[PDB]
């Protein structure tokens, strides 16, 4: 049983600019936490980040061939824009949970719309890095009850 | 340190109709799980459910006088309709997390709008009863780091 | 207790506020007519009015426990605003007919939208008090063909 | 005293296609039941169906010269498209009740709009063929109190 | 034959209902006036009215074969609904003037939209029967300068 | 009872002056009511006051006003201005003329606050003038009822 | 002045920019034709043009004191922007006809909307200068009927 | 009889105006090509054209009684306006392919909406007369694999 | 000099037409009342009315150089159209109260939008001339300790 | 080289998931059929698929330098999102036909809008793999006789 | 004048209010810079500012009679509201460049729309006073290459 | 690199080749001009073009690590579609100026919306290649006053 965590564009910047501005937490820190959590449950977990939509689509297609059972995805800005991503997830038919670090509803009106949310199992937003850890918890329970 | 869990209208019906339809889980089951989780962390947790918007608003006002530090609220249908509830939460200035059992983005278009989400710390939807636990876990960390 | 007739807010004013405007007919007159009609068919009929949304939602929940088979509802202003009501009717899964005394389509544009109509069996509007009798006639035929 | 019942396009198909899914009831059956109801009250009742809008408009004009006192109209698909029909009914100034077999609010969004309903005495939808009878019962009461 | 006047649905009702309500003027009166006005200028003028959109479209096609140089059209309700009419006028490439007796901008908001106006040479509305006369005067001047 | 003027305060207005009286000020709902009652007494007009967080209670109070011979309602519906058709239908149903009041400027806030189910049926509206808006409404009402 | 003709901004440019775009016809030519036409009917006709909305509003006020019985107005660009003009015409309660040289429906979408048309007796557009004469003809018949 | 080709209003004009500039190809030419194509596959093919919506709706009804298996329809302007047509095709339940000679997406925004396209098997637009042949080829393969 | 009262276009017409219909009150009456009220508090009050937006903008600029502390403005029609006015008031940074005699919300939908209201201290509408007095009362309180 | 066939994102999944779900046909099968069809007409045909928008844009730029005369494109999800793709096709000025396997009008509303369709020669949707063959057939005719 | 610089309403306020707030730069300073820049290229340059729309329309008309070859215009608030200005510039057919000191896209949503931008040669916004110099530079190059 | 110039998709096509231009100017010409201009001011300038959004995003991230002080960006089509780009520029917090060669407001309505403009210092459009030079001039002034 395999779980894949996908991080969308710009998330690589976490913790890089003036770690007093938006905090010290990095993408690598998040991935480490998740890997450890998954190891504790004897679940294999892979992670992927890219700024390039095509790479993310290719990565989803590959997940199908690897037997991935569930995707945890923070599509970042692609949530609002990418029908290709939606069609990738639906095309491979791997269930997914959508996660955002920040509360997208508290920001500009264009951020209120998603091409993924309605097909997700569920969505977590605004709880920071712990959102990913919750999604993973849910996923573990669902894969190994 | 006190946490208040508020459940909105119709959530009292959980598990009542044909427990083969939408499942066996009851509101009372959810509350018992949360109370046990909070007790494990030595946090006092209250719960409240009502079908009446006024009762909910009155309960939020009371929370201010009780020193409640965080509200976990499943407003159910009121998320789409109640400005009064938004003004109650902002008026008492108690931070809150919004929770839904089901994925509201997968339903009718009118369910995509919330008078609360933009002012929440964050939102969890579609993860069933575990969403409330995740919220509680976040809240515990935040109140007692 | 077989058929339940629900009247929403302000309908208690019928026949009170100048017999000039909308005539001499009262809510109590309507209920009497309906009770007699139901008695003629050996059907038990209960009636309920409230200005309070929560009271109506509670009444609907009670109906499920009483074995009510069909609801005839004039939600009055709540037709345009109450998702809670929709969710109550759907949550107890009692079929309903929506009734309005007046022709809502002939009034302000905000009255053209309903949170109920699309889930009703059907809708009668603009036929005065007879609209409740027609609904009842339909309901009787359906319950006892 | 005369009543005219008008049926719009495609209603001639009722009961024709696979009567065991869309039902058995025909347009002629509806007419029979209305005629009988009218004959019981000693009211002359005419009926008309066409798939051509022009024929319907012409029929309405003829109704004016015949002294028709009330029109019961199921415009079917015309309700969403025909201003000409609205203008015919207003031009002759014969009051009308609008009827649909099916619940149009439960169907596609474009079916939610009507060029007639705001000018109708009232509207009945979703109650099957009994909606025409209810309309007729109202009309009889109104013409002969 | 040189000029064709087309009247749309319901205009045959002019002057029929309580000639004290909306006046004594008939369609026939208007046609007589326009015929005389055309004769004065040695222009052959034809007229047509119908409640059936197909008959109008056919008439427009016939105009092309008759060498009609300009159409004066009061499409009545069809202005708001008929793309077929728009396409018939464009398809035969005969220039037209749109006329309405009443001020359509003063009525319901749906009457503010036309499938013809943008392709007309011009539009006259709200000037009663004289509007047709004005249109004819323009058309005469244009055809014989 | 009979009250010639009824003042109605919608949900959350009971919170006025309660949270950190340095944040949104010291003025309380009770202070507003006392000012209005003194103003009305000065004109020999009977005034009643009502606040609730429950929409049904407000509707019930409006119905009760009819039976008490109330001649004008001064109403701050607060959040219900944007959501309550029931409130509109209560006021229209009893046919008591009303003036709509808001302490804050609603036009300066979120876009959903720009829409009201009441304003178009009000005699008029006062917003953004704080507690004085109620007094002005009351002054207008007094003039209209006793010219 | 019994009839007042108002021309809005930019109409002073008619005939100035190239013998060809709107052709050789000038504002002064139009005014001379109208004056001659009105003289033929023994009607006093004044004219006014300005680029300044305030000057037009002022001129409409002055019309009320002069006993003007009808206004013929080409508001030009002000039709789409000026509520003040609407309120001036309604405030003095002088009936008016709206005229445009060009067919405003054939142009950009923002030209489709008028703050005047719905309060005009009627509207003439796209018939060039003759549109003003037609309006004048109508006005003459209406005043000396 | 097995396949019915329906052409909507104005399509009879094809090839009639100044063929050397506006196209030589005629509706009759299109029909003759399709008839030959169908004969080659031993499929019986009927054709129909009308400017009258009712004629088309009647024709579609008659198709059901003739055992037509598939309709190829160019509704022309009716595609944007006619619910009646949509309801006729759905009411007889005969699958259809929608064809347009021109590319409708390249024209006015109102031409981007169809009351048929969503219920068609598929749509071909902008390929001229070959679009019909392609539809026919698909239809032949589907009926006789 | 301390308080400036600005009246927008058309307000000069108050009391001028058929005083019985819109009443006897004039703009001069209003100005006299307000002058007397200000004199009673020892405040200097100036007044200005114009039909010309540029005059109003110029007036506001002058107010800055005269030390005006507060503007009471009835922009009339300009409220719905004039960004220039908004930018004048903001540019001079003089606080203002917006006043309307009539209830703008009770009128056409375009009157519901303001380019001023959101930057006003507050707004008074529908209370007739007394609205200007109330605004003045508020201003006096605010300016004097 | 003379014709280029472009497939957008996720089309590489065709036939891969449970060939009983959405069928056995693969992208390669489609390509083979088209290559054979082009060879029959002595036309060179190239094919290209990618999940990455930038690859597609680069491929289109390359086409210009290879003398490609026509593009047959299935942009898949990119049709709804990619202005870059539109600008590539218009920038190299190679005419194109848009193809879709499925009927996009039968799906979610966001799939009804295209950044390509209005600039395509034409569009084929919902006819499965044969849509590409039809497009190719048209293209051959157009390039050759 | 070869080049005319037009400043719209409220731009006379630049540098007047607390030159520490929005800076020390004045309208006169800008005009001086531009006049010097034009003198260096031997181009005659005029400037104009007004708070009155009519004055600006009159000044554009006067520019035509002075042989002005290009206009550089900062319409300020009039860019969102003035069709009269658009029609003045198009009517005299003098090409123009639109300039704004501030970035209008960064402000309220109503500032995102312009009645001039789509007919300008180009637009510069947000570069402060230098935007006028850049426009002038471009204009110089275009007039004297 | 002190200043980075970024060019979006399809701009590589400029000039000879022609995106359909009467014009010889290339992307390389533009870059040469800008490099020479920057060298004249002793500023280091880098340039980048790509048809791949991910490449651009990566390049913006790299700019942060290189100490780039200001970005001049012509996002071309991405301006309308890419939230990832907006988030990249905001995430690295490098100020930017948005440039377009053509006047985007003069084109299709979808080109009127930008995900960047509101966060840019400013915008230049429609001034051709000089727009970049202007931006560069501004930037130089700002970085070295």
UniProtKB/Swiss-Prot annotation, chain F:
PROSITE patterns from the UniProt entry: DEHYDROQUINASE_II
Keyword Amino-acid biosynthesis in record: yes
Keywords: Amino-acid biosynthesis, Aromatic amino acid biosynthesis, Lyase
InterPro entries for the chain: DHquinase_II, DHquinase_II_CS, DHquinase_II_sf
Catalysed reaction, written as an equation: 3-dehydroquinate = 3-dehydroshikimate + H2O
Metabolic or biological pathway, per its Swiss-Prot or TrEMBL entry: Metabolic intermediate biosynthesis; chorismate biosynthesis; chorismate from D-erythrose 4-phosphate and phosphoenolpyruvate: step 3/7
SUPFAM superfamilies to which the protein is assigned, alphabetical: Type II 3-dehydroquinate dehydratase (SSF52304)
Oligomer status and interactors: Homododecamer.
Family named by the database record: Belongs to the type-II 3-dehydroquinase family.
Name of the protein in its database record: 3-dehydroquinate dehydratase
Species, as recorded: Acinetobacter baumannii (strain ATCC 17978 / DSM 105126 / CIP 53.77 / LMG 1025 / NCDC KC755 / 5377)
